[PDB]
Design a binder for this molecule. Structure first.
Ligand code: FNR
Ligand code: FNR
Ligand code: FNR
Ligand code: FNR
Ligand code: IPE
Ligand code: IPE
Ligand code: IPE
Ligand code: IPE
Ligand code: MG
Ligand code: MG
Ligand code: MG
Ligand code: MG
Lengths: 364, 364, 364, 364
């Protein structure tokens, strides 16, 4: 039944109109300055970068999405095997369902069978931390897939509008996270889920020992929109209320600036509406360490292995083109390349006390 | 015949296209910063707040609309009984008609019969203060409904274009108001009617002892538009002139900033185009103490008691969602939550000498 | 044949699409702050103001348009007789045609016959000053209609694209103007003709002793468009070039700011696209002493006397409404009333070195 | 086969939708201040200017486009003969094809036969400098057309997406260029090709002795678009990636500001999307020494000699009109005339550290 929601989620995300519905990443407001003389050759471009104690081929990750049933595990298989081939890290979807039901475990475990070397990231929702889950559940999630880290997702916006939603975010959960991070053999990443991380949230999480963030800003997959559709579907009145919140959240680009600024030493994934290698390039240039993607990886995976391979080739090429055209020989250079910030993103930063000079020094 | 205009008013407002016609609240320019980690649970959210000497359930009020005839009193009945059930304060429409005609009294008195505990707000138009009305008419309006305060409405824009309009706003009217407030057992609120309160108007009213404002800015019910329709209807040439003024006024958001800034200790209702709980939340976050609504309450009430209940539930849920998603456990926390001001609202404030730093300290 | 151009001009202006074609006044960027408590009554509003040594009923003038043939004189008759009735000043069109041809004189003289008291403004084009015209031609123009002043028009943009155009603006013409102003019994106004006066032009003219300006900015009648149409009409290749210049010029609102700022003591008419009393009020509030109108007066006059009366009633009402709703009891109060400048007009002023603070003090 | 690409290029550029596709010059953000009193006569306007050691009639050049085959040479003939007639300088297309194939030489040599006096500009791509080309190939390109200068084009964006593209821009190429410039009898211009020159690229090139730049910014011919079409055509998957980059680059107007600011003493051609004499006027006023055009010259040339003559007449007239209407008697006065910078261009400059005051002094 939670397994039913899991299938609905995938199905609405993949086949309904929810990608960037009434929302925006603000990435249009970020421009990478073109360099007519790059000072490099396309083939000397190096996209390698660190992901905790591993090295990855490309500063892009697949962020967590699914699992909990066979056809979901078959998707997870296709993602993992292609991700392995390309040397790119992969998060799995929430493993709650696999803690609750042993039959769901294989649909997550398959990932490490087929992807023995890339970093694999576990997944549990923050609401579970106030509702009982602790160190052991974490370790179970981790060891079930021999994870190199665990993502704990923030999704209060989704919980609020979800028909069976659990909108529980008492501060107690953070004390518990901080305790759990004491005893855990792998690092914790805290990630949003389409509504983005603000500087207040990031600073709070940092004061509790969290150093790793995944922005998951608005403008990509709209989870409020997904839950609105679930509400429409079962005649729940919450639907029209969700409609008013469709553009709620921190835009991805704003979130990248906010986290990088307020926690300069953070390890930062920039995600939420990353749809090309250009987007990936802007996110990293803006301040992220890596770019994250979910929805378009799902869509390709559903079409098949080769379709997903073609997708990744395209992203990689697009990334390397932005690198080439900015004179960025490696990921480090991309992080310090020249940008222009315009429009609404500019105004958002000014209002939020983000001094653009100290910001340029911070991102490098 | 004034009774006739009362019916026309309700009819055009309810059934014609006058809500936000060529006007804007500027509320799009106000963004509430999303908090991925709220630090609270949805069910611990407390929406209680003070309304003079009473406590109300929710920082929303129904602002004055109608009365003066039976079908109008039946509307007033539906609004009051539902308002009572929800613990939300209700203003009545202008009581002028009930001073002039004793048959109209019941359509206002019904309100206290059916709503014995919530705050009820009396209503008289400022033009009447230069045209004879004083202490005794105020007390009649007040005691006719056992009001907890009296709203005095400003509507010069309406009076200008009204076919039978009385555009009389001599300063003598404020001298009188200030005298009347000496002798009155309840506080006075001064409210606009779709065209908003500026810092000049607010400062002037304050210098006459007025401490309670209701912004009633543009972007909601367009009273110029209503009067234009009345003019078109009776071939009056004023109609085309009204058309040029459709976007005249201080937008609600700008008005909230203006009043809060220029009179920091004011008790402020933010109204004019509040259409959702999100709207209500933005207005409070911006600087209002409570949000006000009129037109959508009318529209629901006309559909029936249960429709109006469903409406209020929706508003309340929406409000609580905005509070949840900003980490606001109570109304006080909402007033100090993080916001972004962009666009035309930003430019309005900059031009008007509203320093954004001293503004942030003021709204707290 | 110049008389032919005169009818073509009136015909294209009146019946073709040239009013604000691809151009803008920027008056959208000017907002008059609404006052919910005006502090005055509509009927105590006083719209009287000085126009040189005369008093006029309303701070609006009809700026020069036509003359030179019978049906043109009949239009001039209708404008003058209605202007007389309302106590509003009237400029006539260029009197060049009547210096060149004695048969054309009656079509200008008719104006003083039928309007014995209002200020009447003569008209000659600046190119004529480099092409022979001097003191005597000026006195003829003036005494032909017992003018209270003479308007010398700037129209180089028009002359450039006019098929028979005379784009001659040597500085010599200003030396001559300054000499002519020595000997003249009435003051000189320098006015543009749909392309606006900049601070460079206004300072230059002032340095030659010109104190009276009429902005005639873009966003109203488009004279480049009119000449383009004349070019299309006679297969002249200049037509497509004109098309690229359709939005050439200083927008009316920018021109008002520019002139007022760079020559603070100027007597300033704000015109070019004034279409309502609201427009008229913005131009005055912005910094003009009076608002000017041409095209919509022409259009009404062509429909007839009573149509033009209805037009002027409408303008006056609209003006008084803007006065009422800003608490402006008289024209002076309107000149110092509260405004907001937004958008492109704000950017224009910032770039041009118009300090908004010293600007507010200057317009008062 | 390189000769095949040469005809494809011309064919797609002339007949497909690639001019300003999803791109912008930012020239809309630049406004020339209209002068109602120019202080000059249209016929005294002098458009003569220097182009290295020659004098040219008009501050406009035709920038390099084509050559390499007969029907291409016949185009080059039409361009050169008309350019000769008007006294405007002409660049030829890349001469690579004529170094590689002796049969292609005539299609470039024809230019000097028919245009013995105007400046003619040679052309070689930067990629060729990394791939073997040196002093002798340069001299062959120069002497083949008795060139007055050689343009070295930057096109890494095009190379990246070109199906047979050579995206090689190692810094080694600049050491080589600086060496070649030692031994060369004519000066070197470095020009972009639709994607614009940034301050980083311009400062780099200057450090290597390059003093002459041609912006070729975005907003005109979109070379990424042309290669996208070539990719679509041969089913190459790079096509969809190109689609994401259609708006990549420095907008022409931004590029002009960037180069002029970061190398104040540069000789600067402003090109990319120059489509009228007004555009040409803005680019010069902004900071360029001359305006450059390619695409619309090609399109006219294909129609024929007389069509191209009519084109140039129109450009010249448009230029002189902008000069007339700003009071610019000669090209120098145009360079210091009054402008307004608004919008996105303004934001671009502010972010890039272009101080608008020091900028106004630098362009004069
Ligand atoms: C079908 C599906 C299912 C999920 C997700 C996504 C989608 C598309 N996402 C959120 C995801 O990881 C990401 O943070 C947001 O989707 C924003 O990225 P995109 O715009 O989708 O690239 C997600 N997040 C997570 O932490 N736990 C979860 O189980 C899921 N579930
Ligand atoms: C039919 C109807 C009738 C009235 C009103 C409204 C409507 C819709 N309003 C104005 C109202 O209280 C409020 O200030 C404005 O309508 C702006 O809020 P809304 O945009 O309608 O929520 C109103 N105001 C008041 O002070 N006295 C009055 O009697 C009336 N009459
Ligand atoms: C048919 C017609 C004829 C003329 C004009 C106008 C029209 C519509 N205008 C220009 C006019 O006075 C005014 O400056 C501009 O038209 C801008 O104002 P409007 O937008 O038309 O109100 C004009 N100006 C002037 O100084 N001398 C002239 O003879 C004329 N001729
Ligand atoms: C058909 C064709 C072919 C070429 C070009 C253009 C066109 C239209 N351009 C680029 C040109 O010189 C210019 O820099 C850009 O086209 C931008 O200017 P326009 O927007 O076209 O005026 C060009 N540039 C160059 O340096 N070498 C080349 O051979 C070509 N080839
Ligand atoms: C986008 C996300 C984070 C999907 C998880 O939503 P759920 O609320 O269905 O996740 P669990 O309850 O199964 O953790
Ligand atoms: C929107 C408002 C304020 C309605 C009141 O209009 P009226 O002008 O009919 O009010 P009274 O004259 O009855 O006070
Ligand atoms: C809009 C205006 C100023 C009309 C005058 O144009 P003309 O150029 O025909 O005027 P004269 O030559 O008759 O002065
Ligand atoms: C816009 C430009 C610079 C066209 C040159 O493209 P190519 O890449 O076809 O030029 P060559 O290889 O022939 O130099
Ligand atoms: Mg959950
Ligand atoms: Mg009234
Ligand atoms: Mg003339
Ligand atoms: Mg090449």
């Amino acid at each position: 039944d939670i397994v039913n929601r899991k299938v609905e989620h995938v199905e609405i995300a993949a086949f309904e109109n929810v990608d960037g519905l009434s929302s925006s990443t603000f990435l249009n407001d970020v421009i990478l300055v073109h360099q007519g003389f790059p000072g490099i050759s396309f083939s000397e471009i190096n996209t390698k970068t660190k992901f905790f104690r591993k090295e990855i081929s490309v500063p892009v990750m697949v962020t967590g999405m699914t699992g909990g049933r066979n056809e979901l595990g078959r998707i997870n298989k296709i993602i993992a095997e292609v991700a392995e081939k390309f040397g790119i890290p992969m998060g799995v979807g929430s493993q709650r369902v696999a803690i609750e039901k042993a039959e769901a475990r294989e649909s997550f475990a398959i990932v490490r069978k087929v992807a023995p070397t890339i970093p694999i990231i576990a997944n549990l929702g923050m609401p579970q931390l106030v509702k009982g889950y602790g160190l052991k559940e974490f370790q179970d999630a981790i060891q079930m897939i021999e994870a190199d880290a665990i993502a704990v997702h923030l999704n209060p916006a989704q919980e609020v509008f979800q028909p069976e939603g659990e909108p529980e975010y008492q501060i107690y959960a953070l004390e518990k996270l901080r305790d759990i991070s004491k005893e855990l053999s792998v690092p914790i990443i805290v990630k949003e889920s389409g509504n983005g991380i603000s500087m207040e949230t990031a600073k709070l999480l940092y004061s509790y020992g969290i150093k790793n963030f995944d922005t998951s800003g608005q403008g990509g997959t709209n989870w409020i929109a997904i839950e609105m559709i679930r509400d429409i579907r079962r005649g729940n009145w919450k639907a029209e209320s969700a409609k008013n919140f469709l553009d709620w959240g921190v835009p991805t680009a704003a979130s990248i600036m906010e986290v990088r600024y307020s926690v300069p030493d953070s390890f930062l994934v920039g995600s939420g509406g990353i749809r090309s290698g250009l987007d990936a390039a802007k996110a990293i240039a803006l301040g992220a360490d890596i770019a994250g993607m979910a929805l378009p990886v799902l869509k390709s995976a559903i079409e098949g292995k080769e379709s997903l391979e073609q997708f990744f080739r395209k992203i990689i090429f697009e990334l390397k083109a932005a690198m080439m055209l900015t004179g960025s020989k490696d990921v480090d250079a991309l992080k310090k390349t020249s940008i222009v910030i315009l429009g609404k993103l500019k105004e958002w930063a000014e209002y939020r006390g983000i001094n653009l000079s100290i910001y340029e020094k911070v991102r490098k």
